[PDB]
RNA sequence: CUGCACGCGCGCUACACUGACUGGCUCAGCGUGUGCCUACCCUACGCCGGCAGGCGCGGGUAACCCGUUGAACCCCAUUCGU
């Protein structure tokens, strides 16, 4: 409610965020041509630093 | 410097989107605005406008 | 036969080991032991006069089960329920400087040493003789 | 171990200025003295080395006179300093436990102190009002008319 | 001859003024010791300058004229025993004669922020 | 139920030592309303009558200690 | 004016320095997850942030 | 905005022995954590204090660290007895 009047109601918003993970033994040069095959605006992909 | 937690990652680049969707509502109201859509990369990012009358903007 | 500490009633194992550390009079007991109150959520001293021996027996038996605990972890396992008078009750942390001294009282008894990372395990001299009197109190279940 | 009763048993004791019960046990019998509470009693007795499972009328006069001495001045029996009432008192700087009409001596003396210099706490003792910053719109009604 | 009754923590006022700030923390209670372990700030010092100046400019064997202040957070230090401050209650300046027993209180103690209620009669409310 | 006493007189210690092992449900609440003793002697004296051997223990729970008469035949 | 004591009261800790990032309210804001919006602004933009109610 | 001769509304703690103390012994789930403005986050371990707490040394932007979240009730013994 935008004020104090009403009948003590509550709305419950939630946002489920998902996370997955994959290892590779790959060279760090061909990682980009696996990176440049999707546009897919609703994801967030990150590549681990190569020093391991 | 450093980046922040994945919980406050996603509300940040949603409240990014909620902010400029309000501004471009206020600006492009005279042009048949009908929303936006964003793509963020670690490069050149692109905000495509879904305006109808594109000759006015 | 081959009896460990796990297969014995442990509420009376702590009674047995308390008399063990008593009659092996080497446990350095602190001197403020009669004005103590033990972890402020409770309002009297312990009813037993030598409560420090049974608290030594207790923190030995727990540290058999949970290798690598410190003085903060001991205060959590001995803390309890604070009554706030007219306000609702809550959990409370234990008392740090009775848990710290009792872990120091057994490290000078050659029963508990520090680990590579933080915490404390028991030395092999520790687990050899509380398994030894675990079997003796399991035999005292028969004797 | 007291398998019948002994030939002597105090029906009342007479310790500082108050007659205390004989049927309580000493750890809870001497809590009748104002200033010796439920927690202060047990520390006095463990300096006196008395058996705690004993009732009040089953101490001799020698055991009582040692318990009287310890609760009177507890500092030289090595009872520490923040166990006491008058820690760092506002006239002497001494550490003491007060146990008597001396308790209510030093109670009104601090109330009449504030009423002498007219602090805000002293005016709320002069009225019948709540002192430690409570509310008054809804509570404490029968402390007034 | 020249004797009254006084001492405060076992320390009398003639040996409280030649006494450093450090061992006034040790004698004060825990809140005022924390207040003096933390700093005294600029306007807390600018009032004591007027308190020192009013003692010197006072006519001899006569109480000084008032210094008006708003700040009612001041620890009453032994340096201004016998002074005359006027401490603000929100509306007016109440004229408070500092005397050697209030030497551990705030200035807000001695200037009530409300007039104390007296009486009335119930009108339409209370059913 | 009021003015109950502690530390047995002779007139209730000759009465405890004679007839209290006779009956069948001896319990510290029972000797608080039939004997005028108030309990914590009903635990204390009845602990040492089991140490004698005039009665038998049955339960020994922390909330209800139950004794009985001892087998005579 | 007189720059030393114009805005001198310390807006720091406390609800003098918190503000709704949309239109500067200070009442009932949501400081969780770095939203920093108020009670009312959040229900406007909750679909745009990415929060769905239940379905 | 808390001022109190009073009235009323949501609550919290109780009036006890189906308990209260003291000591033992033993099990959780949801979730949250260092910030653009923004100063302040969650904390293990080690040592000082009797407690509140105080310093050292780390870890964690988190199924990685707090944490195998040793939660209370309850359980088992002790004391108290209308
Ligand atoms: Mg009852």
From Swiss-Prot, chain B:
Phosphoserine PTM positions: 5, 34
Gene Ontology terms describing biological process: apoptotic process; base-excision repair; cell division; cellular response to hydrogen peroxide; cellular response to reactive oxygen species; cellular response to tumor necrosis factor; chromosome segregation; cytoplasmic translation
Keyword DNA-binding carried by entry: yes
Phosphothreonine modifications at: 41
Modified residues (N-acetylalanine): 1
Family of this protein: Belongs to the universal ribosomal protein uS3 family.
Subunit structure: Component of the 40S small ribosomal subunit. Identified in a IGF2BP1-dependent mRNP granule complex containing untranslated mRNAs. Interacts with HNRPD. Interacts with PRMT1; the interaction methylates RPS3. Interacts with SUMO1; the interaction sumoylates RPS3. Interacts with UBC9. Interacts with CDK1; the interaction phosphorylates RPS3. Interacts with PRKCD; the interaction phosphorylates RPS3. Interacts with PKB/AKT; the interaction phosphorylates RPS3.
Designated name of the protein: Small ribosomal subunit protein uS3
Organism: Homo sapiens
The organism's taxonomic lineage, starting at the top: Eukaryota, Metazoa, Chordata, Craniata, Vertebrata
Chain's gene name: RPS3
Shown stretch of the complete protein: 2 to 58 of 243
Curated annotation (Swiss-Prot), chain C:
Swiss-Prot/TrEMBL keywords: Acetylation, Cytoplasm, Diamond-Blackfan anemia, Disease variant, Host-virus interaction, Methylation, Nucleus, Ribonucleoprotein, Ribosomal protein
Stored InterPro entries: Ribosomal_eS19, Ribosomal_eS19_CS, WH-like_DNA-bd_sf, WH_DNA-bd_sf
Modified residues (N6-succinyllysine): 142
Transmembrane domains' residue ranges: none
Compartments in which it is found: Cytoplasm; Nucleus, Nucleolus
Consequence recorded when altering residue 61 to Q: In DBA1; affects assembly into a functional ribosomal subunit
An example Gene Ontology CC term for this record: nucleoplasm
Outcome reported for the amino acid change (mutating residue 56 to P): In DBA1; affects protein stability; does not localize to the nucleolus; affects assembly into a functional ribosomal subunit
Coiled-coil intervals: none
Recorded family membership: Belongs to the eukaryotic ribosomal protein eS19 family.
Name listed for the protein in its UniProt record: Small ribosomal subunit protein eS19
Organism: Homo sapiens (Human)
Lineage: Eukaryota, Metazoa, Chordata, Craniata, Vertebrata
Curated annotation (Swiss-Prot), chain D:
List of residues that carry N6-acetyllysine: 94, 106
NCBIfam families linked: PRK04053.1 (NF003140)
Family in the record: Belongs to the universal ribosomal protein uS13 family.
Protein name, entry field: Small ribosomal subunit protein uS13
Annotated GO biological process: cytoplasmic translation; translation
Gene Ontology MF terms in the entry: RNA binding; rRNA binding; structural constituent of ribosome
Keyword hit for Ubl conjugation: yes
PANTHER family in the cross-refs: 30S RIBOSOMAL PROTEIN S13/40S RIBOSOMAL PROTEIN S18 (PTHR10871), SMALL RIBOSOMAL SUBUNIT PROTEIN US13 (PTHR10871:SF42)
HAMAP family attached to this UniProt entry: Ribosomal_uS13
Keyword set, alphabetical order: Acetylation, Cytoplasm, Isopeptide bond, Ribonucleoprotein, Ribosomal protein, RNA-binding, rRNA-binding, Ubl conjugation
Location of N-acetylserine modifications: 2
One Pfam family, short name: Ribosomal_S13
Gene3D superfamilies noted in UniProt: 1.10.8.50, 30s ribosomal protein s13, domain 2
Position of the Glycyl lysine isopeptide (Lys-Gly) (interchain with G-Cter in SUMO2) cross-link: 91, 94, 106
PROSITE patterns: RIBOSOMAL_S13_1 (PS00646), RIBOSOMAL_S13_2 (PS50159)
Record gene name: RPS18
Subunit structure: Component of the small ribosomal subunit.
InterPro entries: Rbsml_uS13_C, Ribosomal_uS13, Ribosomal_uS13-like_H2TH, Ribosomal_uS13_CS
Compartments (UniProt record): Cytoplasm
Function: Component of the small ribosomal subunit. The ribosome is a large ribonucleoprotein complex responsible for the synthesis of proteins in the cell.
GO cellular component terms given for this protein: cytoplasm; cytosol; cytosolic ribosome; cytosolic small ribosomal subunit; extracellular exosome; focal adhesion; membrane; nucleoplasm
Swiss-Prot record, chain G:
Positions of post-translational Phosphoserine modification: 8
Pfam families hit by this protein: Ribosomal_S14
GO BP annotations, alphabetical order: cytoplasmic translation; translation
Post-translational modification N6-acetyllysine, affected residues: 47
Residues holding Zn(2+): 20, 23, 38, 41
Principal location listed in the UniProt entry: cytoplasm
Annotated GO MF terms: structural constituent of ribosome; zinc ion binding
Keywords: Acetylation, Cytoplasm, Diamond-Blackfan anemia, Disease variant, Endoplasmic reticulum, Metal-binding, Methylation, Phosphoprotein, Ribonucleoprotein, Ribosomal protein, Zinc
Cofactor: Zn(2+)
Cofactor binding, note field: Binds 1 zinc ion per subunit.
Entries under InterPro entries matching the protein: Ribosomal_uS14 (IPR001209), Ribosomal_uS14_CS (IPR018271), RIbosomal_uS14_euk_arc (IPR039744), Ribosomal_uS14_sf (IPR043140)
Localization (cell): Cytoplasm, Cytosol; Cytoplasm; Rough endoplasmic reticulum
Omega-N-methylarginine: residues carrying this PTM: 11
Consequence of substituting residue 30 to F: In DBA13; results in reduced protein expression; results in pre-rRNA processing defect
Gene Ontology annotations for the cellular component aspect, listed alphabetically: cytoplasm; cytoplasmic side of rough endoplasmic reticulum membrane; cytosol; cytosolic small ribosomal subunit; extracellular exosome; focal adhesion; nucleoplasm; ribosome
Family membership noted in the UniProt record: Belongs to the universal ribosomal protein uS14 family.
Function according to Swiss-Prot or TrEMBL: Component of the small ribosomal subunit. The ribosome is a large ribonucleoprotein complex responsible for the synthesis of proteins in the cell.
Quaternary structure (record): Component of the 40S small ribosomal subunit.
Annotated protein name in UniProt: Small ribosomal subunit protein uS14
Organism of derivation: Homo sapiens
Upper classification of the organism: Eukaryota, Metazoa, Chordata, Craniata, Vertebrata
């Amino acid at each position: 409610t935008p004020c104090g009047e009403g009948s003590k109601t509550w709305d419950r918003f939630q946002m489920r965020i998902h996370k997955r993970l994959i290892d590779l033994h790959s060279p760090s040069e061909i990682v980009k041509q696996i990176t440049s095959i999707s546009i897919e605006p609703g994801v967030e992909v990150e590549v681990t630093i190569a020093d391991a | 410097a450093v980046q922040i937690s994945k919980k406050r990652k996603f509300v940040a680049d949603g409240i990014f989107k909620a902010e400029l969707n309000e501004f471009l509502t206020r600006e492009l109201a005279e042009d048949g605005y009908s929303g936006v859509e964003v793509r963020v990369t670690p490069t050149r990012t692109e905000i495509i406008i879904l305006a109808t009358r594109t000759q006015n903007v | 036969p081959g009896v460990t500490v796990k297969d014995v009633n442990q509420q009376e194992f702590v009674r047995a080991l308390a008399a063990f550390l008593k009659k092996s009079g080497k446990l350095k007991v602190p001197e403020w032991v009669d004005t103590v109150k033990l972890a402020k959520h409770k309002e009297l001293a312990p009813y037993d006069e030598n409560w420090f021996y049974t608290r030594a027996a207790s923190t030995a038996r727990h540290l058999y089960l949970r290798g690598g605990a410190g003085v903060g972890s001991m205060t959590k396992i001995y803390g309890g329920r604070q009554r706030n008078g007219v306000m609702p009750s809550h959990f409370s942390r234990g008392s740090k400087s009775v848990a710290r001294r009792v872990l120091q009282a057994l490290e000078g008894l050659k029963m508990v040493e520090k680990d590579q990372d933080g915490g404390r395990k028991l030395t092999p001299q520790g687990q050899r003789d509380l398994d030894r009197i675990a079997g003796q109190v399991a035999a005292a279940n028969k004797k | 171990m007291s398998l019948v009763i002994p030939e002597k048993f105090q029906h009342i004791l007479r310790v500082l200025n108050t007659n205390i019960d004989g049927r309580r046990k000493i750890a809870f019998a001497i809590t009748a003295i104002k200033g010796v509470g439920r927690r202060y009693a047990h520390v006095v007795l463990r300096k006196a080395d008395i058996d705690l499972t004993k009732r009040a009328g089953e101490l001799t006069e020698d055991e009582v006179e040692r318990v009287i001495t310890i609760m009177q001045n507890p500092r030289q029996y090595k009872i520490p300093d923040w166990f006491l009432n008058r820690q760092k008192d506002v006239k002497d700087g001494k550490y003491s436990q007060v146990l008597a009409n001396g308790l209510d001596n030093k109670l009104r003396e601090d109330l009449e102190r504030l009423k002498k210099i007219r602090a805000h706490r002293g005016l709320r003792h002069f009225w019948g009002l709540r002192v430690r910053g409570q509310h008054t719109k809804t509570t404490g009604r029968r402390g007034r008319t | 001859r020249t004797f009254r009754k006084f001492t405060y923590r076992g320390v009398d006022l003639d040996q409280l003024l030649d006494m450093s700030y450090e061992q006034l923390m040790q004698l004060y209670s825990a809140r005022q010791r924390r207040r003096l372990n933390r700093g005294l700030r600029r306007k807390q010092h600018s009032l004591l300058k007027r308190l020192r100046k009013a003692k010197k400019e006072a006519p001899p064997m006569e109480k000084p004229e008032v210094v008006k202040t708003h700040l009612r957070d001041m620890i009453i230090l032994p340096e201004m025993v016998g002074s005359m401050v006027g401490v603000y209650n929100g509306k007016t300046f109440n004229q408070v004669e500092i005397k050697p027993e209030m030497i551990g209180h705030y200035l807000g103690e001695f200037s009530i922020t409300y007039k104390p209620v007296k009486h009335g009669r119930p009108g339409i409310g209370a059913t | 139920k009021l003015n109950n006493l502690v530390l047995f007189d002779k007139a209730t210690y000759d009465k405890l030592c004679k007839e209290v092992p006779n009956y069948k449900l001896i319990t510290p609440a029972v000797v608080s309303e039939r004997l005028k003793i108030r309990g914590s002697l009903a635990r204390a004296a009845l602990q040492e009558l089991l140490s004698k051997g005039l009665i038998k223990l049955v339960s020994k729970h922390r909330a209800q200690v139950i004794y009985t008469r001892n087998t005579k035949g | 004016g007189h720059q030393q004591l114009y805005w001198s009261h310390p807006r720091k800790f406390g609800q003098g320095s918190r503000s709704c990032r949309v239109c500067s309210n200070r009442h009932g804001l949501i400081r969780k997850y770095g939203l920093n919006m108020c009670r009312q602004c959040f229900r406007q933009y909750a679909k745009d942030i990415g929060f769905i109610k239940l379905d």
